[PDB]
Design a protein around this ligand. Structure first.
Ligand SMILES: Nc1ncnc2c1ncn2[C@@H]1O[C@H](COP(=O)(O)CP(=O)(O)OP(=O)(O)O)[C@@H](O)[C@H]1O
Ligand SMILES: Nc1nc2nc(SCc3ccc(F)cc3)[nH]c2c(=O)[nH]1
Ligand SMILES: [Cl-]
Ligand SMILES: [Mg+2]
Ligand SMILES: [Mg+2]
Ligand code: NA
Ligand code: NA
Length: 157
């Protein structure tokens, strides 16, 4: 059994209902057991143009899946939630990102763990710190509580 952390996001549709449904679906896969869920935060979009605000959270799982098996479950969950994939990025019903998989470092064309952008994302680190403050991010070798930073664009929902 591996302790892993997922980052979830939604910025279109009924954001909160979609996040809750996603967690339930994730938990229903054999080999994934949801053990903790952060508070939900409303967050300003980063890395693109002006877009509707996100609801973001983090989830702790105990898994017996390999990290690629896990990734398949994450992407299937997005499909259950009807996520649209057009030529250009836009708002999405659900995004399920693998943040951390134990202390492992994976670099494959289809999978990068720890997530390559997490250490500079408040919408990740603030909810992650609520459930994983003492977990080590293996690239930096820092605990989450030593990466997190204050960011007024991330608010409790
Ligand atoms: N840690 C990770 N978690 C989830 N998908 C990952 C991943 N590392 C790589 N991927 C790949 O990323 C592909 C595109 O996923 P998307 O969800 O569209 C990116 P995004 O989550 O919108 O952007 P972001 O990575 O900047 O958060 C997936 O099909 C998967 O193969
Ligand atoms: N707050 C926040 N910003 C995030 N930026 C990304 S990737 C660029 C992007 C893609 C589509 C979109 F509509 C807005 C921004 N994912 C995010 C997330 O989950 N939360
Ligand atoms: Cl969508
Ligand atoms: Mg994603
Ligand atoms: Mg993402
Ligand atoms: Na399960
Ligand atoms: Na790579």
């Amino acid at each position: 059994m591996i302790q892993a952390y997922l980052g979830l996001g939604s910025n279109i549709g009924d954001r909160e209902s979609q996040l809750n449904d996603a967690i339930k679906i994730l938990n229903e896969y054999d080999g994934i057991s949801v053990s903790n869920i952060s508070p939900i935060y409303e967050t300003a979009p980063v890395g693109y143009t002006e877009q509707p605000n996100f609801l973001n959270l983090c989830v702790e799982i105990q898994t017996t899946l390999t990290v690629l098996q896990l990734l398949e479950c994450c992407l299937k969950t997005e499909e259950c939630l009807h996520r649209i994939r057009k030529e250009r990025w836009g708002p999405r019903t659900l995004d399920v990102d693998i943040l951390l998989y134990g202390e492992e470092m994976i670099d494959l064309p289809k999978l990068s763990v720890p997530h390559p952008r997490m250490n500079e994302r408040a919408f990740v680190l603030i909810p992650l710190n609520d459930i994983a403050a003492n977990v080590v991010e293996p690239r930096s070798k820092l605990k989450v509580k030593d990466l997190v930073f204050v960011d007024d664009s991330v608010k409790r929902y």
